Design a protein around this ligand. Structure first.
Ligand SMILES: CCCCCCCCOCCOCCOCCOCCO
Length: 172
């Protein structure tokens, strides 16, 4: 049950990412990592199979071990994607999103202070959308970015996936 033919929708999501990066010195510094965040998205449906959406997401590193040492991590990004779906039932859609994202990571260190980073990256998602009612739908989605990137020195990697639950309102 995708949104009706030339209509708009909006929504919000809560996300979790199990590690969107990772650090190290021989010698270990943190123990493992968790990021939690949220995001908002809006889109336009063209027909039952295709829509286009815009979203903004934010992720924050969650505080959890000591052993001296580390600090704050925040990521944010605006994305523009084409959403391709197929109706499995009258209520359940399966879809993928493909497009691009402009992001920014802001770090912090006690030694080094504040640092930032910027990027442009392809984004991909696979998910399920369930129409509770004709105006309210929930989504279960896994989003990933594959990373290649221009820079430094020479590129290697690790951005990882984000899992999320969302709700959206359809202005039919
Ligand atoms: C993958 C890149 C994103 C490309 C998608 C952009 C899609 C843009 O078009 C969306 C449709 O928006 C058009 C509506 O405006 C019509 C208003 O009413 C007309 C006067 O009565």
């Amino acid at each position: 049950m995708a949104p009706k033919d030339n209509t708009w929708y909006t929504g919000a999501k809560l996300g979790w990412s199990q590690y969107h990066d990772t650090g190290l010195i021989n010698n270990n510094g943190p123990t493992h990592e968790n990021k939690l965040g949220a995001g908002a998205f809006g889109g336009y449906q063209v027909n039952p199979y295709v829509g286009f959406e815009m979203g903004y997401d934010w992720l924050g590193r969650m505080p959890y071990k000591g052993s001296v040492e580390n600090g704050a991590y925040k990521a944010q990004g605006v994305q523009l994607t084409a959403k391709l779906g197929y109706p499995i039932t009258d209520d359940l859609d399966i879809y993928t999103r493909l497009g691009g994202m402009v992001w920014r990571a802001d770090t912090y260190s006690n030694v080094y202070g504040k640092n930032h980073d910027t990027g442009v990256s392809p984004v991909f998602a696979g998910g399920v959308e369930y129409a509770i009612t004709p105006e309210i739908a929930t989504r279960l989605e896994y989003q990933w970015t594959n990373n290649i990137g221009d820079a430094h020195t020479i590129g290697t990697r690790p951005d990882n996936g984000m899992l999320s639950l969302g709700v959206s309102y359809r202005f039919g």
